[PDB]
UniProtKB/Swiss-Prot annotation:
In the N-terminus, the macro domain displays a mono-ADP-ribosylhydrolase activity. The central part called, the alphavirus unique domain (AUD) has a zinc-binding function. The C-terminus region, also called hypervariable domain (HVD), is mainly disordered and binds several host proteins. This intrinsically disordered domain contains 2 SH3 domain-binding sites and 2 FGDF motifs necessary and sufficient for the formation of nsP3/G3BP complexes. Disulfide bonds: none annotated. It comes from the Viruses. This is Non-structural protein 3. ADP-D-ribose binds at D13, N27, G35, G115, V116, Y117. Phosphorylated by host on serines and threonines. Changing D13A: Partial loss of ADP-ribose 1'' phosphate phosphatase activity. The lineage of its organism: Viruses, Riboviria, Orthornavirae, Kitrinoviricota, Alsuviricetes. Seems to be essential for minus-strand RNAs and subgenomic 26S mRNAs synthesis. Displays mono-ADP-ribosylhydrolase activity. ADP-ribosylation is a post-translational modification that controls various processes of the host cell and the virus probably needs to revert it for optimal viral replication. Binds proteins of G3BP family and sequesters them into the viral RNA replication complexes thereby inhibiting the formation of host stress granules on viral mRNAs. Residues 4-163 form the Macro domain. Changing V36A: Partial loss of mono-ADP-ribosylhydrolase activity. Changing Y117 to V/W: Almost complete loss of mono-ADP-ribosylhydrolase activity. Changing Y117A: Partial loss of mono-ADP-ribosylhydrolase activity; complete loss of ADP-ribose 1'' phosphate phosphatase activity. The chain holds residues 1334 to 1493 of 2474 of the full protein. Interacts with mRNA-capping enzyme nsP1. Interacts (via C-terminus) with host G3BP1; this interaction inhibits the formation of host stress granules on viral mRNAs and the nsp3-G3BP1 complexes bind viral RNAs and probably orchestrate the assembly of viral replication complexes. Interacts (via C-terminus) with host G3BP2; this interaction inhibits the formation of host stress granules on viral mRNAs and the nsp3-G3BP2 complexes bind viral RNAs and probably orchestrate the assembly of viral replication complexes. Interacts (via C-terminus) with host NAP1L1.
Length: 163
């Protein structure tokens, strides 16, 4: 584990992370996709061998020795708010199991279901709180990645609030 497990936020391309593994915001079919998933496919294309997995699950595939954790958040266009919320919480619980099994000291993680799967709603708080519920009992350094300058400030504020 990390000597003093922390949460941090960075506003940059997750394909440039400085962590021991990466979480992909994957689709269920292991397709190249858009956004985070596209960047992950360009950086670690070998990790898409048999990466398909159901909604609310995570499947790890190694790119050399670098672990890519394919986490499938719900598309809120298709799920009810209630069922979507349950699957989004579950995807993060599966990421915490994988991070623990791999024995990494750090992980790069995006906010699941906040982009093209958001059903056009702002889900920063909902997604980040499910990330915390899952990751709080792990001892990896967690580095949350975002693109938007206002999201960076709100994520930073939420981390600092609980410290
Ligand atoms: N290349 C990309 N990295 C990230 C990280 C966080 C959010 C969106 C994107 S798109
Ligand atoms: Cl960047
Ligand atoms: Cl998304
Ligand atoms: Cl963002």
């Amino acid at each position: 584990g990390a000597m003093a497990p922390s949460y941090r936020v960075k506003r940059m391309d997750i394909a440039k992370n400085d962590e021991e593994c990466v979480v992909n915001a994957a689709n269920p079919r292991g397709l190249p996709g858009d956004g985070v998933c596209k960047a992950v496919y360009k950086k670690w294309p070998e990790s898409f061998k048999n990466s398909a997995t159901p909604v609310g699950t995570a499947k790890t595939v190694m790119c050399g020795t670098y672990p890519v954790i394919h986490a499938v958040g719900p598309n809120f266009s298709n799920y009810t708010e209630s069922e979507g919320d349950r699957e989004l919480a579950a995807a993060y619980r599966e990421v915490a199991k994988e991070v623990t099994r791999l024995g990494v000291n750090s992980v790069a993680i995006p906010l699941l279901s906040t982009g093209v799967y958001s059903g056009g709603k702002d889900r920063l708080t909902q997604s980040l709180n499910h990330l915390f519920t899952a990751m709080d009992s792990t001892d990896a350094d967690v580095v949350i990645y975002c693109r938007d300058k206002e999201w960076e400030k709100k994520i930073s504020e939420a981390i600092q609030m609980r410290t």
